Amino acid sequence: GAMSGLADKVIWAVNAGGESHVDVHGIHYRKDPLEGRVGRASDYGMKLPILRSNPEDQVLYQTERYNEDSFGYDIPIKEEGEYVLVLKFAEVYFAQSQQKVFDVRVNGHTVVKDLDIFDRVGHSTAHDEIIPISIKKGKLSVQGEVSTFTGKLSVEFVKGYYDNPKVCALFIMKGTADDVPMLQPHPGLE
Ligand X SMILES: OC[C@H]1O[C@H](O[C@@H]2[C@@H](O)[C@@H](O)O[C@H](CO)[C@H]2O)[C@H](O)[C@@H](O)[C@@H]1O
Interface residues with ligand X (CB under 6 A) are 44-45, 64, 66, 162-163, 166
Q: How far is the CB of 155 from ligand X (least distance, A)?
A: 18
**Is residue 66 a known part of a binding site?**
yes
Q: How many CB atoms lie within 10 A of CB 161?
A: 13
- Pick 23 or 35: Cβ nearer ligand X: 35
- Pick 37 or 137: Cβ nearer ligand X: 37
Q: How far is the CB of 142 from ligand X (least distance, A)?
A: 29
Q: Could you please report the per-residue DSSP string of 70-133?
A: SEEEEEE----EEEEEEEEEE--SS--SSSS--EEEESS-EEEET--HHHHHSSSS-EEEEEEE
**Is residue 89 a known part of a binding site?**
no
Strands 21-22 and 28-29: antiparallel
Q: How far is the CB of 45 from ligand X (least distance, A)?
A: 6
Residues annotated as binding site?
44, 66, 93-94, 163
